[PDB]
Ligand binder design. Structure first.
Ligand SMILES: C[C@H](Oc1cc(-c2cnn(C3CCNCC3)c2)cnc1N)c1c(Cl)ccc(F)c1Cl
Ligand SMILES: C[C@H](Oc1cc(-c2cnn(C3CCNCC3)c2)cnc1N)c1c(Cl)ccc(F)c1Cl
Ligand SMILES: [Cl-]
Ligand SMILES: [Cl-]
Lengths: 154, 154
């Protein structure tokens, strides 16, 4: 009962790219780039595709950095989120009707306007750690319970 | 907002001692031996004392093997349980009005008539692993959420 999603962080030595969702769901928050994985498509290919669609950037190799499972109380489907990082990109970030990308210096990451789980796992990503997490949500703003640990193998 | 408790498992190569609580709280289940720690008493001394009180056995050195925190929904105080093991004891187990001790072969540990958290951490103890756990209970029979991991240092 899990649906695959990807999440991509463009993390460079002094800054990280995030996107402000402008409409529909998740509007108002900063987040990484990603989406659903297609039938017959690899998870990594889906991650590369969604990075382009949402940010305008072209990535070659993506690196696996985490897996997070989200449970939403009252919803049957779990989200199985495969998290990736890259430092090398081509192109410059594109603002669209859906998404407004911006670079953040690492000390200015806007945690108060990001999903609450990011406060837990993003700091691991910044120190080049890999992780497995599980977050149980009630609505969009409340973590009821979670687990998180560093791993050697994603 | 945590209260200290001890829990002692007499674990020998082929068998483990458990006690059937005969009355009051916990009646009807098999469990290890322990209780509250006194003012001015070390946690280990409290563990040794309670092993004698509840089982009739004298232990010298106890070995630290785990820490488990219990939360009961609707109750303010958490239980901070310090878990110990020993293989060497003196005396023979004593049945009292409060407790009926019995030896169990390791393949016959009565998990269905033990507290539900034991199904998670007891197998770690059997393989000489050390652990930190947290269990959130609703009533006596339902684990709502938990975390458990092996540790090098209790
Ligand atoms: C990028 C975003 O990240 C998060 C979303 C959420 C989240 C919270 N609520 N939702 C709802 C749950 C009800 N179904 C629609 C998404 C999604 C929590 N933490 C995140 N890091 C996201 C979204 Cl919108 C949708 C699927 C995802 F896998 C992710 Cl990572
Ligand atoms: C030996 C027993 O072990 C467990 C008790 C419980 C438990 C479940 N409910 N309770 C109630 C909670 C309400 N306050 C009285 C104890 C205790 C769960 N798992 C255990 N392994 C126990 C008891 Cl009765 C009391 C305090 C403890 F620290 C332990 Cl380990
Ligand atoms: Cl995100
Ligand atoms: Cl027990």
């Amino acid at each position: 009962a899990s649906r695959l999603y990807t999440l991509v962080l463009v993390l460079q030595p002094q800054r990280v790219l995030l996107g402000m969702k402008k409409r529909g769901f998740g509007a108002g928050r900063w987040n990484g780039f990603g989406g659903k994985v297609q039938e017959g498509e690899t998870i990594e290919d889906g991650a590369r595709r969604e990075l382009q669609e949402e940010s305008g950037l072209t990535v070659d190799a993506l690196h696996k950095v985490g897996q997070i499972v989200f449970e939403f109380v009252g919803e049957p489907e779990l989200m199985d989120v495969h998290v990736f990082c890259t430092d090398s990109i081509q192109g410059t970030p594109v603002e669209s009707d859906e998404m407004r990308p911006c670079w953040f210096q690492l000390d200015q990451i806007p945690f108060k306007d990001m999903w609450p789980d990011d406060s837990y796992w993003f700091p691991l990503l910044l120190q080049k750690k890999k992780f497995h997490g599980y977050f149980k949500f009630q609505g969009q703003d409340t973590i009821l319970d979670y687990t998180l640990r560093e791993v050697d193998t994603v």
